[PDB]
Ligand SMILES: Nc1ncnc2c1ncn2[C@@H]1O[C@H](COP(=O)(O)OP(=O)(O)O)[C@@H](O)[C@H]1O
Ligand SMILES: Nc1ncnc2c1ncn2[C@@H]1O[C@H](COP(=O)(O)OP(=O)(O)O)[C@@H](O)[C@H]1O
């Protein structure tokens with residue numbers, strides 16, 4: 038980490054230089070504005086200690102210069118006694134915190150550490166989000182059945198009640214839930230996808246609801262749960278039919294009161310989370326067999342979206358295939374432009390029991406083994422029909 | 423959001439209540455320490471303004487109770503003028519910040535906002551991190567070939583120099599980069615994976631190194647790149663061959679001095695990032711064709727690990743196949759639990775030129791198609 042100190046006071050300045058020097062942080066100093074601007078033009082800094090009062094320039098201008106160029110640089114303004122208004126103005130202008138010249142070295146340490154933590158937290162947030170953005174995909178709804186399902190999704194998006202998405206696996210259930218959140222008034226809020234079937238039943242509740250210290254053996258400290266962390270957002274539970282009966286009851290409560298207890302808790306907690314659920318099974322049968330609460334089935338089933346197989350929407354097949362063609366043609370550095378005229382026929386003729394997920398895997402393999410500029414019916418031969 | 427105000431001074435408690443009101447934040451009050459304790463036992467507050475000087479109790483006492491019970495709670499301490507020393511110790515115990523009774527309403531706003539931002543970033547990061555842990559895979563390393571590579575990795579992760587991972591596609595080069603990271607000294611630091619081919623070249627250089635205003639059409643601001651974001655951690659560049667000659671030059675310098683300039687930049691940046699690269703191609707070739715710099719090639723290959731194809735690691739095939747069947751079976755709630763003997767023999771005899779990725783993709787489709795308890799030779803034979 039690099040720090041830039043812009044102070045005129047040889048005393049206070051040195052104190053700063055020393056402190057930073059002691060913590061193992063690279064430092065550079067500037068006695069005046071013209072020198073600070075020079076350095077600021079040659080080196081990127083993580084933290085800048087700026088004194089609002091400088092001989093040749095008005096500190097505030099430097100702060101403004103810094104904030105326009107690199108908002109990622111934490112900036113701490115330095116001001117004297119009784120100059121709190123400008124410090125507050127400075128902060129309103131983008132300064133993170135401020136130091137009063139003079140002050141305890143402990144104040145210097147705490148203020149600088151607070152700024153360092155913010156930066157740490159800020160970078161982590163950016164990285165995880167940018168990493169997530171890399172995986173963003175664009176969807177295809179060119180079939181009548183889907184074209185209208187899209188419209189219904191637009192109508193239910195801003196509702197606060199739950200949606201139950203059904204259909205054969207690999208049909209696009211999670212995709213639909215993503216759009217529901219994307220088109221809703223919560224879109225900028227978190228979207229959490231949790232597959233109930235793949236997460237260990239014995240860990241699921243602790244993760245969804247969170248737990249207090251000692252609620253179960255192993256629980257050394259207290260941990261928040263997805264419901265809390267996703268507060269204000271949307272929670273998507275895939276394969277809802279695999280929820281334990283114990284878990285089903287707790288879920289019905291949140292859907293009813295938006296309140297719940299952590300495992301081993303006494304304080305009731307409230308959250309505002311839209312719940313979206315999906316299943317590729319027969320829940321009605323699950324209710325009869327007494328494995329799935331009928332009440333929950335009724336509530337989740339208020340708004341229901343049914344996604345039909347790929348077989349029942351051939352208008353989607355080719356478009357989706359082209360989408361995947363391009364996608365993988367990139368990921369794997371290959372020269373596949375499109376599909377042979379006959380190859381397209383095979384695609385349309387196949388039943389795609391795996392549906393879109395199958396369609397995806399097939400094209401990805403076809404593209405990975407592709408030699409020419411096109412994919413023949415023969416290249417789909419070994420892969421499907 | 424729930425906040426709890428614990429102030430005895432009637433005027434200051436009014437300001438805090440007003441500000442919290444202006445913001446639309448649910449508020450609750452206490453004038454004496456013991457009243458605070460009751461409320462604190464009833465509700466889970468997100469932020470607490472705690473005055474240090476209370477008639478019956480000492481603020482510090484409540485501070486320690488909160489930091490221990492619910493650490494999740496942001497605590498802002500209050501204190502009179504010229505009493506800084508008590509506030510400093512307060513922060514030394516877990517208090518996020520402090521206010522000075524009295525002060526501008528704006529001062530209260532800025533401080534409270536910073537505490538709300540701190541909580542927001544904390545929870546967002548915990549969430550994004552946990553959504554990632556959810557996608558962690560268990561890795562299968564049974565063959566003796568992979569067994570010894572695992573051993574080599576261990577001796578490597580303790581070094582800081584770059585590593586060039588080579589091997590056919592779908593062989594597990596990225597899986598290996600991750601293990602190198604987990605076993606290294608920067609395991610707790612970030613690991614950033616980027617596939618140079620999957621991203622259009624123009625968008626790539628900007629993303630990796632960042633850019634300064636004017637670097638290209640519309641770049642209205644200066645932006646950090648993945649290199650800065652991965653600082654202190656590890657960066658994995660897959661399909662390293664697709665790097666533009668310009669990108670190669672910047673990478674070279676970062677490997678030599680940890681310094682570089684953003685795209686169209688003049689404000690030097692310095693990072694400490696371990697570099698791991700992968701390729702299924704022959705760099706030596708690309709060098710002669712003048713497509714890849716020779717010096718970078720040598721710097722990246724200081725340590726070079728070749729990950730063999732599946733057909734040369736037959737011991738991994740059944741273990742891999744079983745792992746995948748189990749994984750996709752749970753994912754789709756299927757009743758499949760294994761492969762018939764005839765199925766197993768096919769998996770072992772098929773050459774898997776697409777390697778592990780091809781195996782994974784084929785088992786996924788087999789599970790999607792299945793409706794029984796086992797996958798037979800017929801379901802596989804049509805897939806391969
Ligand atoms: N309309 C679509 N447009 C683009 N891709 C889609 C579409 N529908 C599904 N997919 C892709 O097909 C695969 C099946 O996805 P998914 O929604 O998870 O199905 P399901 O939840 O029913 O098992 C995913 O990789 C997804 O990105
Ligand atoms: N040893 C392993 N155990 C379990 N899964 C593996 C293993 N090796 C690779 N995989 C999986 O195989 C696929 C190929 O992955 P990857 O590392 O990206 O290959 P490569 O980088 O060589 O192209 C991935 O989805 C990965 O999770």
Ligand SMILES: [Mg+2]
Pocket residue numbers: 591592660
């Ligand atoms: Mg690869």
